Each structure stands twice: as C-alpha cells, then as structure tokens.
C-alpha cells in the first residue's frame, strides 16, 4: 500500500539484522512479561492436567538502525514472528506442545519495542481434586527462558494477573491469578535464572 | 546486547563448525546423562502405557576454537539446540513422539563443554497392574543412542535418579528409581551398545 | 557448572586461537569506544593533574570458529581479560599509571563480539584553575591505540558522553562531557591516526 | 506415521533375532492350528482332486526382548511374513502348490504371540465320486509341519471347524467339517509327528 | 573424536552421492525385511485396529566410492537416516501414520551395505473378535515398496517372525508370528510387486 | 539428493529393460483401474458431448531385477511415466482426446508394483437430455484396452466409483457413479476383450 | 543399479522441469480418478463422522522433454510425489486431515504418464444414524480439486467405485459404492467446478 | 538426463529411508483406493470364478526430506514399486494369484505423494449363473490390507465405481458398478479393519 | 560472445549430468514456489473455468561440479528448461493443457541454484457464480508435485500471493490471494503430500 512504509519493512528487514543480539554494550535483554487469563477450559481429573486459555504479552526492545533518514511515515509494522528473533519463554511443567490460537505477528515500533501475543491453549500439570469444594484448588506453572540465565535475559512484570479479559460464563470461577516473578537456581548451572509462577487458584463457580 | 558476546556467538556458529565430530583424534565422545524425574502424571491401564515428565540432563564436549583471544568475556551463550549437534539418545519403547516442554536451548561454555537439558513427556510401555498393591509396580525404559555403538558414544551416570525434583503431590509415589548404565549386544551388529535403563518403581500414594 | 558451558571456554580458549588477528580478508578492526564518567574524584592545582573515576566501553569482533555444533548452550561466558586480546586504547597524557577499579573480565559472544569494560582511575593533566569561577574550566583528554594506525584499528562512539551514571554528590558538577571522534596525523608517521577526545568542563557545585 | 511405532519396528526387526528359536530352555514351541473353510470352489472327477479356499489360523509365541522400557505405546505391529519365522505347516496331499489369496502380514504382539492368517486356495487328492448322492462324499487332508516332529511342535486346535464364514451360495454344501488332531508315525523316523487332520463332508446342494 | 573417522563421513557425505541410485549395470536393489515383534500394545473393538510395537531391519547395498585410500579406519559410522536413502516400505493397512521410536539413525559399512533399524509403532486394521478364545484372533499387514515394483525393488527376508524379544508380560500371547514373502500384482500396473506379509496370531494370555 | 535412491533409479532405467513384457511365463498382466470423479464440467446439449474430470488410478506388476543387494533404502521411487511402459486403457467413446491434468509420473516400488494416476478431462458421447428432470439422465463410457484382449490384459476393479473425491458444489449432483467391469466380443476378433463400463448417472442439482 | 535408469531419472528432474504446466497450447488438463474402497473402519454416532480407509487412483499427462535418444531403457521409473507436481484433488467435507497409509510414490512413464495412488484414512461428515437397519444409511463426500476449475483441470472416471478390494470381513458391508462425476458452481466463481460424488450406501453386517 | 532430476532419485533413494513408516506422529497411513474396471473377461460356470481386468488407483503420501535445497526442479519422478514400500491391499477371495498387466512403476511427488496404478487381472469366486437372465447377476469382492488394521491403515474411496474405461464391447454389459467403503471385525482380531466392497453386476449383452 | 561464459555452459551441459537426482546424501530437494498474479483473464458460467495469467517463480538447487577453476567469469547463464530437470509441479483441477506465455529459459547459478519462470493462462474449474456481488467469489487450485512425495520433494513460499504484478485494468478486482502450504495425504499412498493451494477471491469491479 504506502510505499513509505513498504521501504521501512524491507530496510529492516532486508538490511537491519540476522538473528543476533544486538546490543554490544553489557545491557541484559529485559522482556516484561504479562498474562491474560482468558479462560479455564478444561480439567481432567484422571490426568491431572488443567488447560488453560491464555495469551502473553511479551515485550523487548531490540536495536535497530534507521538509516534512511526517518519522516513522519508508518510508526509501527506488522510483520511474521518468524521474521525476528523471540524469546525462548516457555511453561515448565506443560504437559503438552501448547497450540497457538493467534496468527504469529508482532508490532515493531521504530524506538525498536517489540509487542507480541500470542494466544494459548496450554496443557499443564494440576490436580482438580477439590474444585467443587468451597476452598478450591490452587495450581502453578512457572514461565521463563528456558536456556537464558538471570544474566541474559531479565523478566519483568507489570502487574499480578489480567481477570478483566476473563469469560464471564467459564466453568471454573477465578478465586485470584497472581504472576509473581522469581530468580530460582538450578544443580544444572550456578547462574540464577528467572521465572514467572503464575499461580492460579480457582473454583467451579 | 553486549558487543564482546555478540562476536563470541557469530564466531562459534559462523565459522567454527558444521555438523560433524570435530575430534579427529580416537576418542570417543561421553555424554552423560541423568534424569530428573518431574512427575509420574498418568497411567493407563488399558493401553499399559504410563507417562512421565522428566527433564534430562545431557553434557558433552565439543572441540572449538578460539579464533579471537578470548578475553574476559561471556563465559557461556545460550542457543538454540538446532545451532549445534545433539545426541540421538532416545527412549527404546516409546509409545509415542515424545513432546517438548521446554525451549530447545543449550547453554555452552567455552571449553566445549554443552549443556543441555530438554523437559520432556513420554509415554512408554509399562503394565499398571497391582499400582494400588503396596507392593507397587516397577516399570523400565532404557534410553541409549539409537545409531551409536558403544565406541562411538559412551554414556555415563553420576547418580542413581534425581528424586529431589519429584512434585510432592504427585499421583504416584515413588518407592525407588535407578539409572543403571547397562552395555548390551542386538543381533544387528557385533558392537556393543551403551544405555542407561531407568527402573522406576512406585504406587499409588 | 554446566557442562556444555565448559566445552564453550574449553574450546575456544584452548584451540581457537593466540595472540594474533583472526581476520585475513582486508579488514580493519573497528573498536567502539564509550566513556561512563562516574565522578571527578580530585583536583591538584600545584600539579595540575586531575582525577577521573571512568568506566570504558569497549567493543569488538574478534573470528571465532565453530567446532562443535553449537547447540542451545551458554551464550556469553565470561572470562578474564588476559586470556584473549585487548586493544591498546591508552590516555595520551596521564600523568601516572591508570589504575583498576575492576577485575579484568570480559564478556564474550558467540557471533566473536566482545564486551569489555575496566574501571578507571586516571589521573591525566590539566588546569584546576578557575574551577569556582562560573565559566568552570575545561579538560581535554584523548584516547586511542598508541600503535595502530587507522588503517589497522578503527575508533567509533554511539555517543558524546554518559553523563548519567555521575555521581549525584560529587565535588565538581559537570557542566558537559564530550567525546569527538578525530584522526590526527603525527610527525612519527604518514598514517592517520584515530584517538576520541574526551573534553570535561565541569565545575565545582 | 508413530514415532513409537516406528522404534518398535525397527527394535524388533533389526535388533530382535535372525531364524533361530530364541527359546533355550527346555520348550517346545505349539502353534495353534484353526481353518475357516471359505468354500469348495471346485471338484475335477477326471482329476480326483478337490479345490478349497481356505483361511488357516496361526498363532505361535516367539521370544522377544524388551529393551527400551515399553511405555505405553503401539501394542501390535503388522509386518510382512518375510520378515519373522514362520510353521511349516503344509498339506501332505496337495495335488498343487497352493496358491495365495491374501498378503503375507502377521499382526505381532508386546507378549510375543503372533497370530499369522494366510488364505489360500489348495489342491488336494479327493474322489468326487457319489457327491451328488444324498450321503455324500468325504475328503480328508492332513496339515502338519513336515520336518518337525511332535517334540520340536507342537500343535493345538481350538475347535473342529469353522462353518460361519462358508459362502452361503457355494456349490456344495457342508455336510460337516472337522478338525482332529493326530499323532501318528512315520517309518522314516522314530518320532511321533502331529498333524491336523481335516475331514470334511459335502455334498452338492 | 578421531580425525580418520571425520574424513570418511564429509567424503561419503559431502562428495559420494545425491538421491540418485548410483547402480548403472542392470541390477535392481534388495533390501532385506525383518521384523522384531517388541510386542501388541493394545487392541481396539470398536476401532478395529490393533497396534503394533515393532523394530524394523533393513539392509541394502548402496555403491560408494573409495577415493582416499582406504587405510585400517573406521569401518562403520553412524548418520541420520535424512542423510541418505532409504527405502519407501510402508505398512499397506496403517490406520494412522506411524509414530518413530527411535533416532534414525542408520550404520553404513564400508562394502556399502547399510543397516537401518527404527523402532515404530503402527496401528493397522485388524478385528480384535474373539482375542479371549482360545483360538485367538489372526491379522495380517503387508510392508512392502508403495511405488517400486519388483524390478526396481526385490524384498527378501532371513526368518519367519523374531519373538525372542518379545516382552514377556506383553497382554497379549503370541501364538505365531510370520513374515512371508509374496508377490502380488495390481490393476494399476503390470509389474509385480513384491511385499512381506506379517501374520501373527495372538490372544490374551 | 540420496545416493542410495540415485543408484536405484539408474540401476532400473538404465539396465533393467525396454518395452517389453518382462513376464515370461504364463502370465497375463492384470491391471486394476479405479475411477475417482472428480466433476462433471459441462454438458452440451447441442454436441451431446459431456466433459468428466476424473483422476484413473491404474495399477499393475512388473517384473524387476534386483542386481544390487537392496538393502534399506529408497523403497519407492517416482519416474515419469514416458519411462516405464503404460497400459492401451482408453475411453472407447470420446469425443476427443483426452486433456492431461497432472504431470505423468509413476511410483514404483521394489517388488515391482508401479501406481499411475492421471488426471484427465475428458469429453465423451452422452445425450445430456432430461438433466433438469428429477429423474435425472444417464450416461456411459467403457474404458479398456484398445489393442489387448483379455488373454494378454485382465481388468480388475476394487469397488464400484469413488464419490467422495467428488466436488461439493459441482454443477451437477451424482445420482450414482458405478464401474462394472464387463467382457466383451467385437466382430473383429474372437478373443474376449475386457472393458470397465462406467455408468454415471446424474442430474442439476 | 542401472546406469540407464539413472540418467534417466536425473535428466528428467534435473533439466526437465519446474512445478509448471508443461502444456503452452490450448489444453486443460483432465486427471483421472478411481476409488477403491478398502474398508469402513469406523463410525462415530456422536461426532456423526465417518473413517474410510481407501486408495485414490489419480492418472494425468505431463509433457515431458526427451534429451537423449531414448532407447530400450527404464521405461517407468518411480520417484518420490514430492518431485512432481501432483493435483489438488481433496474431499470437500473431511472433518480432520487426511492421513497417508502408503509412501508417495509415483511411477512415471516417458509418454509422460503418471500414475500416483495415495492410501488414506479420511474422516468425513456423515450421520452413521440407522447403521443397523436394513435400509442402512447413505454417505457423500466429493473430491476434486480445490482451486482448479473446469477449464484447468477436467475430472474422468472410468467407473462408480471398486468393491473388490474391500475387506471380506469389514465391520461394515457395502450396499452400493457410486462415483458420480458432477459438474457443480459457486457463488465465488462463475467458473464452473467438476468433482467426483463418492456416495457409499452401507449396513453392518 | 538431466542432471537436476537424477539428484532428486538419488537423495530420495540412496539416504531417504529403508522399509518404515516414516511418520512418528500418531498419523494412521490412508490410502486412497479406487477401482477402474477395464473389463470382465471371462467368466467359468464350472469354476465359479469370474475374471476382471481392473487397474488400481492407490494414493498415499509418504514423509520425505528435502535436504537439499528444492530448486524449480523435476517435480515428479516415476520409479520401480520396488524401490518403495507399496500397500498390502489384496482381494479377499481371489481363486488364483493375480497378474500384472502393468510394469511397476509409481510416480512420486515432492510432498511425499505417491500414485501407484497397477493392472491386474483378477480371478475371484463368483457364480455366473443366470448371466443370460435379464436381472443378470451380482459379484462381490473386498479388497484392504491384510494385516493391517483400521488403525494402521485407513481406506478411502472417492467414488462407486469408473465404468468410462470399461471396454465398449465387452462380453459382458456392466449394469451398476460400486465399491462401498465398509469396517469389518474378524474373529481374529478386536481391531476393526476397513476393506473396500467392489460389487459389480452384470449381465451378458 | 565470451569464451569464458561458452566453457561454462558446455561443462555444464556436456559433462554434468543426465537427468537423475545428484544429491547422494539423504536430502530431498526442495523447491519454493511463488505466484505472480498477473490478472484473472475471463470467466465462463456454462463452463464453470476461469482463466488466470500466472507466471510462476520456481526455484531450486541442483548439484552441480566446478571442474575447471572458476575464475571471475560468467555467474549466471541462461539456458533453454529442456537441457536441465525441472520440477513436476501442476494444478490438480485444470480443465484444459495450460499454454505457455513465455520462452522456457531458466537462469542457472554456479552455486547451482536454478531460477525457472515460467508464464502460464491456465484454465482451472471454478464457479464464477455471483462475482457481481460485493461478496464476490472464491476459488481454489492446488498446485504440487504430482508424483513426488514431500520426502521426495518439499514445497515451501515466501509469503502469500503477489499482487502488484497485477493489471491495473482488469476485469475483475482481487479481493485477496494466498497460497498457503499444505501437505495432504491420497488414498493411493501412505506418503504426505505437499501442495501450494492458491486461493483467490475476486470479484468484478
């Protein structure tokens, strides 16, 4: 459409960078991570195994370069995950490959930030026992780079959980999300290395 | 981010090797390998097949060179597993594909030495019956390098099995699990072949 | 630690390469240089020498070879500076030994990228004189590699100067920090030669 | 299609065992004999011989062995003949090499037990004579392993025969069909040598 | 690891051969089957299929060429099966793909025999009716080349059926496991086609 | 690409043989053809010709030389079908030659069995008269061998027409598509010919 | 193995041609296509869908080039489907993806005949409702190809739909298998569109 | 011939894969079948046993790597049957082996899509009795895998019957065509297996 | 013209290959495809076909050897598409032979990767039925290898369909085209397909 901002796509893409971090400088890549409880799908008390339908916000900032000089043209593009480098963010204990409910596209901004979500059906483990019960049951997962230590990559959150998006007629009644971020060490590696443990205590309403 | 561990990364991955032994000498390449196992998640009677979530440990060395002096820079880069050669250990009865729940990374350090550890879900060949008996039941999987003989790839074990990990409201108790290393002869071929055979043995809590 | 981090250092420190330029095809080696000027610590007006509490960015591309697959593994490893090579980069005119206010660590990357950053304690000469006054007074300071010509290193800066880091309560205020790229020539040689000039003015408070 | 098929395949193909009775204690191996006679396709009066179509039942236990630990995956494979030992069983007075209707695949099972069903059409010695005749006439073939003798095999059978199947329009009628097991004696050798003897009584309608 | 074995590899690999079959002379290619049946994993009444853990042998000459002088070396090495050729047999009823147990993985020889082993797990067609009875229940599946006749291709196999590996508490018993090998012909072509019938006769314990 | 696969296609094209029926003894070529319609296209009234989109599934045994040992391999191999010999089946009743949808390539497979599928359009005799009526109008074509009798070729079919490939919103609906393969004389010549009759019967939706 | 084959298999896809329609004149390609119903595996009452395994004949024409003098050589040679472009011909209501049973293979002829016949598992819509009554129930899927409209590709078939290959002992008899070629439009397009209607009447037994 | 195409075999071939279901993932093999009766030849009032010249329509699609690099390139190549695994389809109750028509050639495509077309003549059980007769008389023949079960194998059939090939004049006139897809259980086996019902009736001109 | 570039294409053309896939290794060739809208040429009702003008970007790499020294010379020649292989690549539903626009000439590169465009009008079934509306009309053809197998051949596509090519003045808007990947699997063969399925929706102005 806009030839402006069709040479902003392919001046990044084409010319701008392999995949590569970057950032030269001693500057960690700081990725805020948010989640968006969209619903409890499903339970499996044989299986133990809960399915959640959720989508991540992930925000980076990558360096660009501008080398045209830049006009007031097309701010941000839309353009395929595939195109540019994600992080390895992944659920620990999942169950299954998670699917994806959303097209893989991210907005870039000049600035550099890059906005991706994604969209969830996640598989984890999580005994049901006890939903029915006034109580409810509690489960966690935790989200974080599988291979970047606390050094590489840091996460960050802005806030506990997003309810708001929640279906309003789910089967299962959110008691509350929290989305606590911990650095937690493992006998693999002496580096420490960062996660979200999003615990979600629920109950059929 | 850092310029110093940007060149460290292009280098190993630019110039530095394609899939290949990089040992010209004799020696056989050792990986040793342990299992955490995570979780007994389900079993199935009908189809006597039991799943379980472990994540596997897997270090080996790989020759690299140093091109650049190395100065005091970044010890260890992340990559994805794809970048570099993996084993081809796998589980001998798996019923099914077994799934990934974790991001293929690896972290590698500058003596060669690679770390990898994949969270896994695998489903293999194991009879259920008598779980609820207190004697238990005990099921086997032997996981070994598919194509590898013995001279090829050497496994070893530091320990019997990682318990520690084991989620405190499992399913299933574990009354006991072993990695024992074990060389064995097929009919296919006069080499001995290496596999590490994990016996585990729990019941119903 | 890990493993696969090991061979990482291992085989880059050990193989890869002495001291000596990687690259063959005809390239120079650009540095880039950044200057944190954490504080002016002191000023000596019989001397007319001046203290500087600096940190120095340092970035380069050094050829690193791949041997071994690279794998998901430690991105970055850090190691001391001693064992891979450093550019020159010295003040022209200190008055005395510049000191180290951190270990010799670097940072490394897989792509050959290296990051190192000393802290610094210069003592480098110029007048106090009418510090107090309003006007303040100025210090010129260059940097570069004593030996290399601009054909065999390259000097660049991203900035003028990082005034941030400044220490809130420090004895002089900084009215302003620059680092101007220049290539000079010197009678010793006919070759173009690349140093940044870092010019203070700052003030007492 | 199945990664865990797949690996079941190949262990048991490659690995597994050439011809060779994998059983070294002291056992003799019995194969259960069945036939579901399909129809009486023809009868030659000049020729005295008959023409069956017949399926014939097989099942034998081999020993396997389990080495990657079974999980719960692929019970039973299907493989060509070829590929494992099979009985010799054969008719003793087949006038024609029998000729087969179907593929040769065997259906394997975890236990070991195969269970291997050929059709066939076969010719036999058998007078005609009288088959219009309300009495009848009767035919008799004996199958059995033609080396083997009652120690090496052994053989078993279910029931007497099975009539189910027979084509309701065929051109002659059952009178009726049996399947009786003998031991009977050869003066090549001293050994007992088991046969099914199957006798059966038609008539044209 | 060793230099002389890193030579044959990238020789055979880099310049021997893309997928072409590198025999000129008229001669078509065999390829031993085997099957080792691991065991029945499960059987579906209202499905009517039955699975199969099986481990598939398959050897065949491929023409290699000898440039550097062959010296006593590494006379088997292993490669991913993607590397080379490898034969189209498939299971002619698979209700489902079929599901890899094991790395593909293949050892070649220096005569340039092959030998490739995966271990699979198949679901094909079979009615499971009257597994109780002591007569059991026989199947059939038919492996064979989907595309090459018996010109391009000859299939061969060693032995019957190999139970030795057989798990010993499989469900299901195996009465007989035969692989048998038959030529059949289709409408679509005149050539003959030559396949490995796998019968195998089986029960419950 | 695959060495193996590479010698396998020159071993068979370039040595194995010429046109000419490889089948020495007495064997007549069966080749079952199966029809999948597609679409019927048009109608002409005034022509009285009817166009049919219909893919022929044609099958048949060639005799094939294994020379090289086959070992596991490239099982089944794709060749344009001017390569291999192809059967005289034609349309007794177009109205003009037949169009080619798809590329002409055949797999073949080693024990010789060769799968060709074209696609065709077709345009055969057929009054179109009545379409619009409930009753709907019918129509048939025989496909067969122009040259060979029944003696040299034999016809076989699996079923009666395969609907379901069939477009859903074709311009006319399938009453019943139905394939009997028939034997016929012609005054010609005193050998039995035979032809598959399709008889479609259809109607305006 | 043959030389003669092998040239032929490489000047065919290396010179001949690109994923392209050969044919510059005015001529649509007609793809011919043949079912054969192998077996009804499966209904589901609930899902209200229908698992059919079959074999799909598809024959087209390709043009194809002859280089080099042919001479009595390797008159079909098969190659992998992946190699030539094949049609698009698919069931218009098939609840999941269809699976393959066989490998792609193809066999190629030098008139430039091609004759692919796939396996598949297809699940399609269909209401098993009234299975056990004598009427039985009725089921239509229509194949043809997606995109191409008559005028591209033109659909033939030889006959309704073949019986004989089904199993004898199906879970399901086959009261009458149709293949109706039908021309149909589309609101999208005034193009008309030609598939094949497999209707399939069917009891149990 | 050309160069570009003879890599193509090759790679396929030589590396691609050794008789295995390639396909790990839980994927049942389907495989399309459809029967094109060319013509019924002859028909034996004594034998009962009727003769049908059919050519087979099978698809199914294979997994194949591409390791090089696809280039617009020879996209279908055709190949001996024997170089690649074919199904074990087979008519249930044929009197006699049946006969290859055709050369084995299939082609393949670059997906891994394979069309197979045999050409066979097929003797079966059928009584001819009342051919004369103006109702004429009914056939019936299932073919589908042997061994394989629903789950391993999934038939489907796009439609009835292809009657356009059938041979214009023919002995006998085809009055409908079917081929019903139909699951069947067997005594043998709990597993459903799918067969395809060819029925054809037919009646002497 | 240059004596240089004549040495080239001789070895080349002279002494490089015959068609036959040189790739050895097991790698299949991958091809990636691209559609160049040019414009929706014309719609016919009665016929249910619509004409597009399409060329199609087809790319590949052959294996090709550099005998004499490459020196700076010629990179790329042009050559006729008859002297090298090209893919199989055809629409599944093309009502007629698709006519060739331009000169088959292909740009060959000395990494031996080929470039192939060629210019089609291609016919393929469609319904053209209610373009008028602002719905407009949608219509679907698959273009894939017919023979080849995805092992034997892999399709891949930079992105969706390209528009700007197409004429401003067209008859009929484009409301969108894409070509989305997909890999299906046939009857005929247990091996996947892949096949580009080009969906345009169009509407008149």
Redesign the interface.
């Known amino acids: 459409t806009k030839k402006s901002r069709e040479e902003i796509v392919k001046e990044i893409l084409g010319r701008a960078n392999p995949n590569?971090?970057?950032?030269?400088?001693?500057?960690?890549?700081k990725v805020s991570f948010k989640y968006s409880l969209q619903d409890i799908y499903t339970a499996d008390v044989?299986?133990?195994?809960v399915e959640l339908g959720l989508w991540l916000v992930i925000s980076w900032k990558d360096r660009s370069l501008s080398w045209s000089n830049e006009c007031t043209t097309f701010n941000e593009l839309t353009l395929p995950s595939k195109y540019i480098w994600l992080p390895?963010?992944?659920?620990?204990?999942?169950?299954?490959?998670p699917g994806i409910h959303s097209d893989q596209l991210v907005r870039v901004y000049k600035d550099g930030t890059v906005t991706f979500v994604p969209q969830y059906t996640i598989r984890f483990?999580c005994?049901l026992e006890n939903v029915t019960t006034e109580q409810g049951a509690a489960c966690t997962l935790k989200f974080g780079?599988?291979?970047?230590?606390v050094?590489?990559l840091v996460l960050d959150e802005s806030q506990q959980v997003d309810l708001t998006t929640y279906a309003g007629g789910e089967r299962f009644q959110l008691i509350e999300a929290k989305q606590k971020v911990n650095k937690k060490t493992y006998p693999?590696?002496?580096?420490s290395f960062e996660d979200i443990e999003l615990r979600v205590t629920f109950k059929k309403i």
Do not use: L
Request: net charge negative; hydrophobic share 25%.
């Open positions: 590569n971090i970057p950032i030269v400088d001693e500057q960690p890549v044989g299986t133990d195994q390895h963010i992944e659920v620990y204990n999942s169950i299954g490959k483990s005994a780079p599988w291979t970047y230590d050094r590489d693999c590696c002496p580096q």
